[PDB]
Write a protein that binds this ligand. Structure first.
Ligand SMILES: *[C@@H]1O[C@H](CO)[C@@H](O)[C@H](O)[C@H]1NC(C)=O
Length: 160
């Protein structure tokens, strides 16, 4: 009942994102009722810029390099900027992203390689870090859904 299965046998409860592949690249897929939200894993909340509250259009080259996602090249406000036009040198459109979004990829336990959602609720407590609630061992974990305790699905965070 519910959840989504991709890759070959990887179940991902609703409101659950995860990394995948759609050819020669990786695509971001998430369980959402009965339609896995599969979409590139690039670009994020785009504000202001030469796009005026619009999405991006990667890849986008600039200065002589081919950026495949937001970048801080040129900007000094802290956030990253992205081009909103396949041909940056053409449209010259762009947009300032927000903290280059955030997508965690936990694994082991239950969230079989599930793109942990940060932040993540816990027992009704806004959490923004691989919490070890009930751990006590060298290792942290987070919630695969905005409502962990409400989703009953956790996963270990990267070790690198
Ligand atoms: C957790 O944070 C979100 C927005 O960050 C808010 O809508 C939600 O109500 C918060 N949950 C609790 C239990 O405070």
């Amino acid at each position: 009942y519910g959840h989504c299965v991709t890759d070959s046998g990887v179940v991902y409860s609703v409101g659950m994102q995860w990394l995948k592949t759609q050819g020669n690249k990786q695509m971001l897929c998430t369980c959402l009722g009965n339609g896995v939200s599969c979409q590139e894993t690039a670009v994020t909340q785009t504000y202001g810029g030469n796009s005026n509250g619009e999405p991006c259009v990667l890849p986008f080259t600039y200065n002589g390099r081919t950026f495949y996602s937001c970048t801080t090249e040129g900007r000094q406000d802290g956030h990253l900027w992205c081009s909103t036009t396949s041909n940056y040198e053409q449209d010259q459109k762009y947009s300032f992203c927000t903290d280059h979004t955030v997508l965690v990829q936990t694994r082991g336990g239950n969230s079989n390689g599930a793109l942990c959602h940060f932040p993540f609720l816990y027992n009704n407590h806004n959490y923004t870090d691989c919490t070890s609630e009930g751990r006590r061992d060298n290792m942290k974990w987070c919630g695969t859904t905005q409502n962990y305790d409400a989703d009953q699905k956790f996963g270990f965070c990267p070790m690198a």
